Amino acid sequence: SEMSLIMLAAGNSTRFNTKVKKQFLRLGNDPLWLYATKNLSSFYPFKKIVVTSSNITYMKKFTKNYEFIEGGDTRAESLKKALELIDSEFVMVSDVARVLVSKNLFDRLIENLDKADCITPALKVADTTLFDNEALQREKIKLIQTPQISKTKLLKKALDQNLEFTDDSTAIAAMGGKIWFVEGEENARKLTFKEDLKKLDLPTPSFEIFTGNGFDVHEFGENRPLLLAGVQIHPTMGLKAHSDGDVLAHSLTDAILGAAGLGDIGELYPDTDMKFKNANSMELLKQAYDKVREIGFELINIDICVMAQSPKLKDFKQAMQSNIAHTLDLDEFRINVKATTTEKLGFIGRKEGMAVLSSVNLKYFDWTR
């Protein structure tokens, strides 16, 4: 009979993590989770394809071809929830972090479908093996891999109570089910540690570059320091409300989120109830960039235009640039701040307020390092 596919792509491991989540590393044009799913999907006409996710909203923006379901607290819980979507006799289950699974291994699992309740790849070990620094008999060791094929009904039953299983074979085996072991492959290794990247022949990120714009206006008339990019410009010529009033930081935040497709500052820091009154805007900026780095992006450069009749920003431009660099952990040369008056024209010219235009270019994080 027929087979469905569950791709396990939820949870957030710190084991690997730089600031970037491993599921959003770019392989060619595709985020890793999509690359892995596309790969396995190409092997077989699955009845249904399910992806477990901790970021459904974001992932849905990348395809219309799969069913997404919110992950659970463990692999086995994400799996159990996704199984309720499956009604085919068989289900293939795979870690997304096993990216380069070959058609060959797939065929080897498929050709053995009727031999057992669960079919899984495995590798032997020829190294001395220590458990808790004490020697084990290495010949009796199996390292288990994925994809794994199971009878759907049995795997469902297998996960009725125990959600601790790290794979499907131990789950099925613990209820008396039979396992068929198939030889595994180095291409089915699981990306877990930062050091695993160079052990795999992964496609490097595409060269696409994303543009962001930011525009913001604050009003003059608050008796407090004027802070722009966290730098004091004037002791008393402050702007009203919006935390510490840093229109620059706010405009720049919008550009960075915009280039990454992550909305705007009001969606990230909803300030309608005056919740952010005491916020440091440069910290808000830093946290917004953290969000952008999590999904696999990196800044190339920043260019800014401050529109203000007064005060003159000339003596502060290098310091603003340097503070932005430090906040975002960027080299200083990548930041530029400009200014113009409006020749005493309009609301800006009347000194009623000031505006800031920001432009940003983002590329994909180069995990090649």
If you compute the radius of gyration of the chain from its CA atoms, what whole number of angstroms results?
26
In angstroms, the first-to-last Cα distance of the chain is 46
What would the two tokens of residue 162 be?
Answer: 């125990």
Residue 220 and residue 125: Cα distance in Å, rounded? 70
Helix (H, G, I), strand (E, B) or coil at 84: coil
Per-residue binding letters, 297-336, with Mg ion (x by CB under 5 A): ----------------------------------------
Tokens of 318: 């290098």
Bridge-based pairing state of the strands 297-307 and 353-364: antiparallel
Query: Which residue, 114 or 127, is less far from a copy of itself as judged by CB?
Result: 127
Q: Which of 84, 105, 80 is nearest to 165 (CA)?
A: 80
When asked if residue 347 is in the footprint of ligand GPP (CB under 6 A), the reply is yes
The answer on whether 137 is annotated among ligand-binding residues is no
Distant-in-sequence contacts of 220-224, Cβ < 8 A, 24+ apart: 220/351, 220/352, 220/353, 220/354
Tell me whether residue 14 is annotated as binding: no
341 marked ligand binding residue: yes
Q: Answer yes or no: is 121 a known binding residue.
A: no
> Which residues face 45 on adjacent strands?
none
Rounded Cα gap, residues 346 and 225, in angstroms: 24
Please list, in sequence order, all residues whose beta carbon lies within 8 angstroms of the beta carbon of residue 210, skipping any fewer than 6 positions away: 259, 260, 261, 297, 361, 362, 363
Which 241-260 positions form the footprint of a copy of itself (CB under 8 A)? 254-255, 257-260
Measured distance CA(21)–CA(32) in Å, rounded = 10
- Residue (168 or 246) nearer to Mg ion, CB: 246
By beta-carbon proximity to ligand C, the closer residue of 69 and 363 is 69
The answer to whether 95 is annotated as binding is: no
Q: Which does 135 bind (CB under 5 to 8 A by kind): Mg ion, a copy of itself, ligand C, none?
A: a copy of itself
Q: Using the rule CB under 6 A, which residue among 355, 356, 360, 362 binds ligand GPP?
A: 355
Beta carbon of residue 224, minimum distance to Mg ion (angstroms, whole number) = 18
Judged by CB under 6 A, which stretch of 72-80, 117-125, 180-188, 341-349 contacts ligand GPP?
A: 341-349
Q: Is 298 helix (H, G, I), strand (E, B) or coil?
A: strand
Of 368, 3, 17, 7, nearest to 204 (Cα)?
368
Nearer to ligand C, 13 or 287 (CB): 13
Contact flag: residue 97 with ligand C (CB under 6 A): yes
Please tell me whether residue 117 binds a copy of itself under the rule CB under 8 A.
no
Tell me if 313 is assigned to a ligand binding site. yes
Question: Quick one: 89 or 295, whose CB is closer to a copy of itself?
Answer: 295
When asked if residue 59 is in the footprint of ligand C (CB under 6 A), the reply is no
Give the number of residues in contact with ligand C, rule: CB under 6 A. Answer: 29
Q: In 3D, which of 133, 96, 105, 86 has the Cα closest to residue 44?
A: 105
Partner whose binding site includes residue 211, from ligand GPP, Mg ion, ligand C, none (CB under 5 to 8 Å by kind): none
Residue 219 interacts with ligand GPP (CB under 6 A): yes or no: no
Residue 239, phi then psi, degrees to nearest 5: -110, 155
Q: Which of 4, 37, 39, 52 binds ligand C (CB under 6 A)?
A: 52
Question: What is the contact surface with ligand C in residues (CB under 6 A)?
Answer: 8-11, 13, 52, 71-75, 78, 95-97, 126, 166, 190, 264-267, 308, 312-314, 339-341
Question: What is the contact surface with Mg ion in residues (CB under 5 A)?
Answer: 216, 340
Binding site, residues? Answer: 216-218, 242-243, 250, 264-266, 269-273, 308-314, 340-343, 347, 350
